[PDB]
Ligand binder design. Structure first.
Ligand SMILES: CC(=O)N1CCN(CCCc2ccccc2)CC1
Length: 161
């Protein structure tokens, strides 16, 4: 997989976290090909964020599924390669129902709201929907896929608001 899709940016680090301690933590969920704490070029003081690179996307998934991560005593904020919990799903036409969207998207994350859009005047389905999840990583996984097939339709999916 492209390296960009195997990275996790890690915000909110303890300033005492090092390359070595960040690595020892995140190696619990996969092989790390890279692990860096960002520091000031003059003082060497941590900037409070870094990144790790796993060998595979499944390892990224395992790390994200193991949140919350407390690294060196502080809960950190990992994100993949803006942070929203809602998607627009277009191209679903008039025959797509809630259960089609739920059965597919529930495998990306926990769904809180499905809104199938209807015409304000006639009530007819407009052919698009919004899905809201309990967490942003679902959306991040969704929007990096080239394709989404739901109810036989190839759908357009994008972050919403
Ligand atoms: C997906 C996306 O929009 N982005 C991912 C990267 N984000 C910032 C990471 C900055 C960084 C971290 C670690 C080493 C160097 C630099 C913001 C942009």
């Amino acid at each position: 997989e492209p390296e960009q899709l195997r990275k996790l940016f890690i915000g909110g680090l303890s300033f005492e976290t090092t390359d070595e301690s960040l690595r020892s933590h995140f190696e619990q969920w996969g092989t790390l090909t890279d692990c860096v704490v960002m520091r000031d070029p003059n003082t060497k003081r941590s900037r409070g964020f870094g990144f790790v690179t796993y060998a595979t996307v499944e390892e990224v998934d395992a790390a994200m599924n193991a949140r919350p991560h407390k690294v060196d005593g502080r809960v950190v904020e990992p994100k993949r390669a803006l942070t929203v919990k809602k998607i627009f799903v277009g191209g679903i036409k008039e025959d797509t129902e809630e259960h089609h969207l739920r059965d597919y998207f529930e495998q990306y994350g926990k769904i809180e709201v499905i809104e199938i859009m209807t015409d304000r005047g006639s009530g007819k389905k407009r052919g698009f929907a919004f899905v809201t999840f309990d967490d942003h990583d679902s959306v991040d996984k969704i929007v990096i896929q080239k394709y989404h097939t739901v109810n036989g339709h190839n759908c357009e999916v994008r972050k919403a608001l």
